Design a protein around this ligand. Structure first.
Ligand SMILES: *[C@@H]1O[C@H](CO)[C@@H](O[C@@H]2O[C@H](CO)[C@@H](O)[C@H](O)[C@H]2NC(C)=O)[C@H](O)[C@H]1NC(C)=O
Ligand SMILES: *[C@@H]1O[C@H](CO)[C@@H](O[C@@H]2O[C@H](CO)[C@@H](O)[C@H](O)[C@H]2NC(C)=O)[C@H](O)[C@H]1NC(C)=O
Ligand SMILES: *[C@@H]1O[C@H](CO)[C@@H](O[C@@H]2O[C@H](CO)[C@@H](O)[C@H](O)[C@H]2NC(C)=O)[C@H](O)[C@H]1NC(C)=O
Ligand SMILES: *[C@@H]1O[C@H](CO)[C@@H](O[C@@H]2O[C@H](CO)[C@@H](O)[C@H](O)[C@H]2NC(C)=O)[C@H](O)[C@H]1NC(C)=O
Ligand SMILES: *[C@@H]1O[C@H](CO)[C@@H](O[C@@H]2O[C@H](CO)[C@@H](O)[C@H](O)[C@H]2NC(C)=O)[C@H](O)[C@H]1NC(C)=O
Ligand SMILES: *[C@@H]1O[C@H](CO)[C@@H](O[C@@H]2O[C@H](CO)[C@@H](O)[C@H](O)[C@H]2NC(C)=O)[C@H](O)[C@H]1NC(C)=O
Ligand SMILES: *[C@@H]1O[C@H](CO)[C@@H](O[C@@H]2O[C@H](CO)[C@@H](O)[C@H](O)[C@H]2NC(C)=O)[C@H](O)[C@H]1NC(C)=O
Ligand SMILES: *[C@@H]1O[C@H](CO)[C@@H](O[C@@H]2O[C@H](CO)[C@@H](O)[C@H](O)[C@H]2NC(C)=O)[C@H](O)[C@H]1NC(C)=O
Ligand SMILES: *[C@@H]1O[C@H](CO)[C@@H](O[C@@H]2O[C@H](CO)[C@@H](O)[C@H](O)[C@H]2NC(C)=O)[C@H](O)[C@H]1NC(C)=O
Ligand SMILES: *[C@@H]1O[C@H](CO)[C@@H](O)[C@H](O)[C@H]1NC(C)=O
Ligand SMILES: *[C@@H]1O[C@H](CO)[C@@H](O)[C@H](O)[C@H]1NC(C)=O
Ligand SMILES: *[C@@H]1O[C@H](CO)[C@@H](O)[C@H](O)[C@H]1NC(C)=O
Lengths: 220, 85, 198, 50, 149
């Protein structure tokens, strides 16, 4: 068939009518971004020749090709670690959440680390790690998955307990229904709207987080 | 180590910042040469409660440097002269 | 090691040039790496073969050099587009983007020329000397809920004030810095305090 | 079939007509000894970067 | 024969290293984007449209992934919109009144001022409006009273 772009939506425009929203949806969406690759190193001499000494004697006639290939692969290998360092190590303080999870009805158990798991991952992060399945060597990454999970846990604890203050300086504590009100005022909605409807916003946020986990568990 | 066998470095139980990266969380430093699991950051527990806030009473005007490359050396190679002269 | 980013580019370009110059010393399987030696030693039927081996080796070396030069040119172009974005948004204006123009709340920036590069001096505002206060979302007065227009309600233990969020400057909670929305029955954590009227 | 490797005992049970074993990358990683019908894994010798 | 094998394997290795360098440039661009999203969506609230999810961005949460990062963007989506009759200004006592932060709306008989992203009607007073000029200039100004506290 000839494809159809989208459903037609004739907006009811006139010169003296406006549409004002009377309600809201707290919507959580996923964005997946690759950060690093597998750090591969190739012994050029062993890949071309193995253990044959006559082959290496003939390979010395071509000069420093193997040195250039090894140096390019070394640059890629250190670039992957630099990429992981720039992405995840944006804080030099390892923050923790308080033991009591009283955030005014807001539930973060699906994104906070699970103490029962030995990998110290969140249930969402555990599901993400479950859903991913001759001179050649594979160099291990400099940051292990446990420390990357620790960095994300520190970022989550900072953005839950301290707002955006930890990203600009010292972590200044603030209650989460106040942090949320500040975010509401950042998008141009008054604080009262957040405070009056705080139970509904917390329920919508928890439902959206559960739908995120269900959608990740149900989509290959 | 998980990266391989390290000979000539004394393994310690303390955690420091990474000076020379070994890999798989192992780093080396000179103080003799020691090898250790890196420390991510200084530990900090934020004193969260549902009715307390922290308000700054002072400020620091901080100037930081950011170095960004713009161009390279403009190199041209005569291909015929390079191959053949 | 402060200027290592520019020196890395300079060292990579100089090392690529040195490798390309060094590749002329290789014979690539021929009898010699010097073209004049082959042309002065051999008849053209076999000098054609030796020169052909030298040509394909040097052409492979030159194509390799041009390939990483184009890759490094793409990287430097991306870095220069980033630098132009920082020049537009941090120097020619004040940016709300976090950590785009330095660590902290960005105030302004200064450009400085550098050999094959630019150095941005980011002047930023860092909060310091923080102090605990007891806070509330709203003030209950005369059956009405009062919310701060731009600040936040704080208490030093006995008295309630309203202050701006990034600096401690306590002021009397009045009708001029608060607004009224609803009663006190809905907001969780509302406290009782008087609201002054000028 | 010649090569260089460490020859260890293998848990792969060959069918009686099969003699060698290959992985995905078409490298001989399993073999049958012709003298005594036993299966041996061929692990590559442990070379590494210094 | 070994020279033929050497030049074939060297061409294969150069091809592999070249495509690995191109993929490394692509992954570096993606990682620079991911670091930008980490700085601007997680460590702060971003005004950039569709940079941190669809809708008005509230906050974001980072999650580690195998060779990657997953951002959970928590955003505000307006819903259940309603028609209202609107005017740019209110004419009162020969003066034009404009909303300080909101917008004038009418449900058919009465005029209110509300914030732009949520319906919260309030009485049009001098505290939420400001005066600029007379009623002869603004096109579409309507007559309504302005309460004084
Ligand atoms: C606002 O009023 C307009 C105009 O009456 C409405 O637009 C019409 O909606 C009906 C309902 O299905 C459609 O059949 C018409 O085709 C629409 N007209 C146009 C020009 O699009 C609009 O639905 C009203 N909005 C709300 C939220 O009630
Ligand atoms: C705004 O929308 C929310 C849901 O998005 C509404 O909350 C629902 O209210 C109905 C009836 O009161 C309940 O049956 C649902 O269980 C509620 N949903 C949730 C998630 O709590 C709310 O009533 C709407 N408000 C207005 C004014 O339309
Ligand atoms: C936060 O949400 C979590 C998960 O949705 C809730 O934990 C569930 O609690 C119920 C009731 O005890 C159990 O039946 C479920 O098995 C729990 N789920 C998991 C994944 O453990 C939790 O109750 C919510 N509230 C708080 C305050 O944590
Ligand atoms: C605000 O009060 C809290 C709680 O009284 C303080 O947090 C304590 O700080 C001391 C000193 O470092 C620690 O020994 C305690 O373990 C902390 N308690 C908790 C629960 O973390 C906090 O330091 C105070 N802030 C200011 C600026 O005075
Ligand atoms: C805010 O911090 C500044 C630091 O820059 C303080 O200024 C210092 O004050 C002390 C005490 O009088 C002097 O000895 C220093 O020389 C001052 N430094 C500078 C750079 O002027 C300032 O007093 C602090 N203010 C408050 C209210 O704590
Ligand atoms: C909180 O701040 C208020 C205002 O600065 C303090 O009230 C003052 O207390 C001093 C000390 O006796 C009196 O001399 C002033 O007359 C008080 N001002 C007013 C307006 O009453 C209050 O004492 C502070 N509370 C604490 C616990 O330090
Ligand atoms: C804040 O003031 C309100 C209003 O005076 C108090 O609410 C009253 O509480 C008493 C005691 O339970 C009841 O008998 C009244 O009927 C309540 N009045 C209203 C209008 O709700 C409230 O208790 C006060 N809170 C504090 C912490 O002092
Ligand atoms: C527009 O809103 C106003 C204010 O809410 C409505 O006026 C109220 O109408 C109800 C129903 O008759 C009365 O009980 C109230 O006393 C009225 N309030 C005032 C201040 O007059 C008005 O009816 C609404 N108009 C439409 C067309 O919906
Ligand atoms: C709004 O009020 C203004 C002034 O109160 C009205 O303007 C008057 O219109 C009448 C009829 O055309 C004239 O006789 C007067 O001279 C006008 N007065 C002024 C000061 O211009 C205007 O017509 C009203 N508009 C509506 C829609 O009621
Ligand atoms: C904070 O939690 C305590 C329980 O520890 C509760 O009594 C109090 O009302 C809560 N305050 C707010 C503002 O939610
Ligand atoms: C081959 O000789 C070995 C020597 O021990 C013997 O065990 C075996 O039975 C013989 N036959 C086969 C088929 O291996
Ligand atoms: C809108 O246009 C109509 C004609 O279609 C006109 O009568 C009316 O005055 C206009 N209103 C405004 C506010 O421009």
């Amino acid at each position: 068939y000839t494809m159809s772009l989208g459903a037609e939506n004739s907006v009811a425009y006139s010169n003296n009518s406006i549409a004002i929203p009377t309600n809201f949806t707290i919507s959580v969406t996923t964005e997946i971004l690759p950060v690093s690759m597998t750090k591969t190193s190739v012994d050029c001499t062993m890949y071309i020749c193995g253990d044959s000494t006559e082959c290496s004697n003939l390979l010395l006639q071509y000069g420093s090709f193997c040195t250039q290939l090894n140096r390019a692969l070394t640059g890629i290998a250190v670039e992957q670690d630099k990429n992981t360092q720039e992405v995840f190590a944006q804080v030099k303080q390892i923050y923790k959440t308080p033991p009591i999870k009283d955030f005014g009805g807001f539930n973060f158990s699906q994104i906070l680390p699970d103490p029962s798991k030995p990998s110290k991952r969140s249930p969402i992060e555990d599901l993400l790690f479950n859903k991913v399945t001759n001179g050649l060597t594979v160099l291990p990454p400099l940051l292990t998955d446990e420390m990357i999970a620790q960095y994300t846990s520190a970022l989550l604890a900072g953005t839950i307990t301290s707002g955006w203050t930890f990203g600009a300086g010292p972590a200044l504590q603030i209650p989460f229904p106040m942090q949320m009100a500040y975010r509401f005022n950042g998008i141009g909605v008054t604080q009262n709207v957040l405070y009056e409807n705080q139970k509904l916003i917390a329920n919508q946020f928890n439902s959206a987080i559960g739908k995120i986990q269900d959608s990740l568990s149900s989509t290959p | 180590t998980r990266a391989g066998c390290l000979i000539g470095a004394e393994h310690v139980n303390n955690s420091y910042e990474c000076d020379i990266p070994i890999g798989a969380g192992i780093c080396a430093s000179y103080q003799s040469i020691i090898a250790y699991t890196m420390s991510l950051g200084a530990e900090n527990s934020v004193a969260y409660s549902n009715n307390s806030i922290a308000i700054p009473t002072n400020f620091t005007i901080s100037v930081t440097t950011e170095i960004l490359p713009v161009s390279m050396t403009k190199t041209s190679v005569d291909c015929t002269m390079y191959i053949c002269g | 090691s402060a200027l290592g980013k520019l020196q890395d580019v300079v060292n990579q370009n100089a090392q690529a040039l040195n490798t390309l110059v060094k590749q002329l010393s290789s014979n690539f399987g021929a009898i010699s790496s010097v073209l004049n030696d082959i042309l002065s030693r051999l008849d053209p039927p076999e000098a054609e073969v030796q020169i052909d081996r030298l040509i394909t080796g040097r052409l492979q070396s030159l194509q390799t050099y041009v390939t990483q030069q184009l890759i490094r040119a793409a990287e430097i172009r991306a870095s220069a587009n980033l630098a132009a974005t920082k020049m537009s948004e941090c120097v020619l204006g004040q940016s709300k983007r976090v950590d785009f123009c330095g660590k902290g709340y960005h105030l302004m920036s200064f450009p400085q020329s550098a050999p094959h590069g630019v150095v941005f001096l980011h002047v930023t505002y860092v909060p310091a000397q923080e102090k605990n206060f007891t806070t509330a979302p709203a003030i209950c007065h005369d059956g009405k809920a009062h919310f701060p227009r731009e600040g936040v309600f704080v208490s030093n233990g006995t008295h309630w004030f309203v202050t701006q969020r990034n600096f401690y400057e306590p002021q009397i909670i009045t009708t001029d810095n608060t607004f009224v929305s609803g009663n006190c029955d809905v907001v969780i954590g509302i406290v009782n305090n008087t609201v002054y009227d000028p | 079939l010649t090569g260089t490797g460490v020859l260890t005992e293998s848990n792969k049970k060959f069918l009686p007509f099969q003699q060698f074993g290959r992985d995905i990358a078409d490298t001989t990683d399993a073999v049958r000894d012709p003298q005594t019908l036993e299966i041996l894994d061929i692990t590559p010798c442990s070379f590494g970067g210094v």
